[PDB]
């Protein structure tokens, strides 16, 4: 029951990982600002190597939709 426990598997679809991250962060005790910062930092930090590369190359200005689509070619079902 901690956001720190959320790390993308090497074969895990990025969409599945973000889903787990989001649901866990909803339940986490934190201010909205801290949750925003957690998302801006941990989500990319804890992504698998290839998704992490894509996300960083996209940059912090990327939207959720773009982000999901940009990573959908990595990993398995």
């Amino acid at each position: 029951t901690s956001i720190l426990d959320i790390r993308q598997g090497p074969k895990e679809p990025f969409r599945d990982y973000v889903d787990r991250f989001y649901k866990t962060l909803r339940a986490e005790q934190a201010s909205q600002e801290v949750k925003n910062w957690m998302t801006e930092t941990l989500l990319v930090q804890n992504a698998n190597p290839d998704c992490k590369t894509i996300l960083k190359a996209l940059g912090p200005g990327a939207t959720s939709e773009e982000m999901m689509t940009a990573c959908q070619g990595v990993g398995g079902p």
């Binding site: 973000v18 889903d19 991250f21 989001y22 962060l25 909205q32 949750k35 925003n36 957690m38 998302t39 801006e40 989500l43 990327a62 939207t63 959720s64 939709e65 982000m67």
Partner: peptide, 12 residues
């Protein structure tokens, strides 16, 4: 993205 972006994407 932020948590608010995720809220917007998924809804409740």
């Amino acid at each position: 993205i932020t948590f608010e972006d995720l809220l917007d994407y998924y809804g409740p």
